[PDB]
Structure 1
Amino acid sequence: RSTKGASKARRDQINAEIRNLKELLPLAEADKVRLSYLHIMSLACIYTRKGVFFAGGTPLAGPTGLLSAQELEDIVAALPGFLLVFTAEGKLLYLSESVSEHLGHSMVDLVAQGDSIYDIIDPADHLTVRQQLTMPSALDADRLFRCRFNTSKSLRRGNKLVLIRGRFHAHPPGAYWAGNPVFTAFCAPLEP
């Protein structure tokens, strides 16, 4: 006189492969504590899209490791801002862990509100980001604009204005990358 016992297993299997996703994420052991399921899904959608992008693309030019990993991290920290690269649709691709000090919330805690750039920015400014992102890089490059990211208090909505500065680049071929070039950006705050 029921249908349970099977749904209870489908959920425990889906929500255990999700914990597999979580354990495989290349984040610090201490950061994998709270990690709501829809937050693990977001971190996974970022990582497994910050590879393919590099996997199907041309092997990155230049020599093999002129600078150490810790050296590149120290340069990333020395930067007056934080790196943030996201696709033309809005989906994120790489958020710099240097944002821990320029925004208050760290990288992990920030990708919890969503996955698109349109999930971290205050909705009022969303319109702006759309007009500077619709036109691809035919020849229009080195775009610059401003938005109100989302400094907060641990749940949702002071909001620090940031000056986004960057230019679109090349996307690898395929289905998903259909007119979706990636857009690097040197994000810097407007109230140091």
Structure 2
Amino acid sequence: RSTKGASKARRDQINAEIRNLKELLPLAEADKVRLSYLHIMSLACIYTRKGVFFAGGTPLAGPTGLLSAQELEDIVAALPGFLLVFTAEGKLLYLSESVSEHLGHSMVDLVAQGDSIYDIIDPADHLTVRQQLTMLDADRLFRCRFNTSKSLRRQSSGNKLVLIRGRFHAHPPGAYWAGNPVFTAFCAPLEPLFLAMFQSRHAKDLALLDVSESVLIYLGFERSELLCKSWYGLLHPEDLAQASSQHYRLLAESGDIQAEMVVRLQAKHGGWTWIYCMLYSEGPEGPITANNYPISDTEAWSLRQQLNSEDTQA
């Protein structure tokens, strides 16, 4: 007979429950008004997954009543990255506010188009990311480009590089948590306290013209004992070819080339330290500047799988 006025109540009922969700969503009402119904039904899923994952676990929360006024909500601002939590299939569970500093886009802004990690990162990395999320070893570190802001695309040369260091956690008893673990990660940008770095300056034959003084912590050598030593004299003979070919690439008929490599360096007392090494040229045939990132063998293996797949797809 008459489907209008009858089928209307259905729509204005589901679009009233959506609205009773958005007035509950933990956001600020400066942006809680420009939120499409599609956002609410694509952004409240993340909150609901947070709720069901956390409320359904043993109270393994480290402390109880110590950081209990705002210090936990203040250290997050001072950390050199942003927290990111998701499922192995790519669906997010939490993204701290802090992302606004690092990608230039709000949490209310990135995930408003979609549900999953693959709506924020660059579609050129989707394969690589997927690889690392399918490969028991509770550790995973991989390097990835995230979509940036239009306010920082005007000032940075594209989408940001981000190191992603995390581990797959013990999933709670559930239906979707079954067979789908939860990956918690610290994600810091690499294109300029937990982010271990000693930095170095090399000449055109990778000799240590200078090094940061935090090297003593991760190698046992004072800066005094390392100056003018040959970097190939700190390497492990297995990683010889990798560093040599990256050094060739770094020495071309131009400058301004990034060179990625995961290597081992020999410490003072002789233990081998895993170093993710980002070499860039601060000038064509000028200086060599290297960011060094100490990592664990699991993280080194993950990042090597990354770079192997990348050089494969060149």
Under a length normalisation based on structure 2, what TM-score does the superposition of the two structures give? 0.56
Measured against aligned partners, the alpha-carbon deviations of 1:31-69 in whole angstroms (never above 9, x if no partner) come to 212101111112210111101101121123433221035
| Higher RCO (CA 8 Å, separation ≥ 6 residues) | 1
**Shift in Å, 1:75:** 0.5
Measured against aligned partners, the alpha-carbon deviations of 1:12-45 in whole angstroms (never above 9, x if no partner) come to 1111110100001111222212101111112210
Q: Are 1:50 and 1:94, in contact at CA under 8 Å, matched by a contact in 2?
A: yes
Q: 1:179 to 1:154 in 2, by over 3 A?
A: farther
Q: Which has the higher strand share?
A: 2
Q: 1:120 to 1:178 in 2, by over 3 A?
A: same
Q: Are 2:104 and 2:152, in contact at CA under 8 Å, matched by a contact in 1?
A: no
Identity within the alignment, %: 100
Q: 1:164 to 1:176 in 2, by over 3 A?
A: same
Measured against aligned partners, the alpha-carbon deviations of 1:56-94 in whole angstroms (never above 9, x if no partner) come to 211234332210352112111100111111111111001
Q: How many residues end up aligned between the 2 structures?
A: 188
Counterpart of 1:48 in 2: which secondary structure? helix
Q: Which moved more, 1:62-71 or 1:82-91?
A: 62-71
Q: Are 1:148 and 1:161, in contact at CA under 8 Å, matched by a contact in 2?
A: yes
- Say what the alpha-carbon RMSD is for the aligned residues: 2.3
Q: 1:40 to 1:69 in 2, by over 3 A?
A: farther
Q: 1:22 to 1:154 in 2, by over 3 A?
A: farther
- The equivalent position to 1:142 in structure 2, one of 102, 125, 139, is 139
Q: 1:63 to 1:148 in 2, by over 3 A?
A: closer
Counterpart of 1:31 in 2: which secondary structure? coil
Aligned partner of 2:311 in structure 1 is none
Q: Which moved more, 1:114-123 or 1:15-24?
A: 114-123
Structure showing greater radius of gyration is: 2
Counterpart of 1:171 in 2: which secondary structure? coil
Q: Whole-Å Cα distance in 2 between the matches of residues 85 and 69 of structure 1?
A: 24
Q: Whole-Å Cα distance in 2 between the matches of residues 152 and 63 of structure 1?
A: 36
Measured against aligned partners, the alpha-carbon deviations of 1:130-170 in whole angstroms (never above 9, x if no partner) come to 110013xxx42321112221113399993111111111111
Give unmatched runs, 5+ long, in structure 1: none
Q: Are 1:113 and 1:120, in contact at CA under 8 Å, matched by a contact in 2?
A: no
Q: 1:92 to 1:156 in 2, by over 3 A?
A: farther
Alignment of structure 1 residues 43-192 onto 2, 5 Å: 43-135=43-135, 139-153=136-150, 158-191=158-191
Q: 1:121 to 1:62 in 2, by over 3 A?
A: closer
